[PDB]
Design a protein around this ligand. Structure first.
Ligand SMILES: C[C@H]1N[C@@H]2[C@@H](O)[C@H](O)[C@@H](CO)O[C@@H]2S1
Ligand SMILES: [Mg+2]
Ligand SMILES: [Mg+2]
Ligand SMILES: [Mg+2]
Ligand SMILES: [Mg+2]
Length: 416
């Protein structure tokens, strides 16, 4: 819409730091580049197959017992290493993530944490076995290595408590919490998890789980977010879902995976974070592999409109979104993370959408930091003038405009 509305939208870079380890410094550099290019948020998966975040206190109370903090940490490290024993590291610490959140805040970048369940939770499943919780895995064509059995109360109680502890930490630090719910038991059903849930009359139980996670988020002052997969599958509403969840919409699925259309979810009142699959890059994916390789993602930042929801033609279909999310995935977590690839993709998305993205405010912030905490009244009026002239509302089309403003502040400070 208007200048104001476009800049009000979220522009998100998503990083799969669940499957693959990222150091605090790597994530800080991603925050840096996000701020420079005019993004508003970094979406950070911390639970996604691997579980790569440990709180200082991981004491868990569930099932009428307590699991000691040291036992929980040990079990999670085991689970994550079992998924993929990343040579770069295992888990981020509470101090590291606190530091990341604060660093992002200083640059007007939000953090959006994701801890995935009941799918994409390999590490949690093994962790639960280590803690004496037998058979946490769903069991269809085979025993799943990724997905929790909704009928296992002991495991369900534990995971809810675990997610609550993470939510407790993010409460008052982040606006949004993404509980995921994508791709239920894909590994055990030939990617037909929702069909299998329905077959076994467990889709109502899946809704109950998602509805609970959504209430948990809201209760702790977090906007709940989830991927679209499990919501109103096949545009049916015999089973109801919480209407306050922000939907990260990425795909309407494929043959035999009949996800609800964005039109149908819009009719149910959902708002969307446009997480179009067209923009995906999977680390190490090459043109010969098909799917989300870098050249395709980069090309799509131009071809797929900012507001275009997957499975729809924009503006012919124009559904309300709060903004858009470009996603970096680590399906094969041993693939090398090459920061410049991610930066080029991030830059392409911003360059194709200069009206949505902010200008680069880093030079300005550095310059304001030089303001001395007994000068001429003439030299002061000028510093006040240049300061008053600063414009914090500029988009990426107006970098030269901003640079001039900053230069005037530089001169006034040096003409002190
Ligand atoms: C919601 C996300 N679910 C899947 C994700 O785990 C994959 O990494 C990605 C790339 O294969 O594709 C989809 S998007
Ligand atoms: Mg088996
Ligand atoms: Mg309904
Ligand atoms: Mg995307
Ligand atoms: Mg690497």
């Amino acid at each position: 819409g208007s200048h104001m509305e476009k800049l009000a939208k979220n522009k998100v870079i998503s990083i799969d730091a669940g499957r693959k380890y990222f150091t605090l410094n790597q994530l800080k550099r991603i925050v840096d580049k996000a701020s420079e290019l005019g993004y508003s948020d970094v979406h950070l998966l911390l639970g996604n197959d691997g579980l790569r975040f440990l709180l200082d206190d991981m004491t868990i109370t569930a099932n009428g017992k307590t699991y000691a903090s040291d036992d929980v940490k040990k079990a999670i490290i085991e689970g994550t290493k079992a998924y993929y024993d990343d040579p770069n590291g295992t888990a981020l610490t509470q101090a590291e993530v606190t530091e990341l959140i604060e660093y992002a805040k200083s640059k007007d970048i939000g953090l959006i944490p994701a801890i995935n369940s009941p799918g994409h939770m390999d590490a949690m499943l093994v962790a639960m076995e280590k803690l004496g919780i037998k058979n946490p895995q769903a069991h269809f064509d085979k025993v799943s290595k990724t997905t929790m059995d909704l009928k296992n109360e002991e495991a369900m109680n534990f995971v809810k408590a675990l997610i609550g502890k993470y939510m407790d930490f993010f409460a008052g630090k982040t606006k949004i919490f993404n509980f995921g719910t994508d791709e239920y038991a894909n590994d055990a059903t030939s990617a037909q998890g929702w069909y299998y849930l329905k077959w076994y009359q467990l889709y109502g139980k899946f809704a109950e789980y998602a509805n609970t996670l959504a209430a948990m988020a809201k209760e702790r002052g977090l906007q709940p977010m989830a991927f679209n997969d499990g919501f109103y599958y096949e545009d049916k509403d015999d089973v109801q879902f919480d209407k306050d969840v922000l939907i990260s919409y990425w795909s309407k699925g494929w043959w035999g995976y009949n996800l609800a259309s964005p039109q149908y979810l819009a009719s149910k009142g959902y708002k969307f974070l446009n997480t179009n699959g067209d923009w995906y890059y999977i680390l190490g994916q090459k043109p010969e592999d098909g799917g989300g390789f870098l050249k395709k993602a980069i090309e799509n930042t131009g071809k797929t409109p900012f507001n275009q929801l997957a499975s729809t033609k924009y503006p012919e279909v124009d559904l309300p979104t709060v903004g858009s999310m470009l996603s970096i995935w680590a399906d094969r977590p041993s693939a090398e993370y090459k920061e410049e690839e991610i930066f080029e993709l991030m830059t392409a998305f911003a360059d194709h959408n200069k009206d949505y993205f902010r200008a680069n405010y880093n030079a300005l912030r550095e310059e304001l930091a030089k303001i001395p905490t007994g000068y001429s009244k003439e030299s002061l009026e000028a510093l006040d003038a240049a300061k008053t002239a600063l414009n914090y509302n500029l988009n990426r089309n107006k970098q030269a405009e901003l640079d001039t403003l900053v230069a005037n502040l530089k001169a006034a400070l040096q003409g002190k």
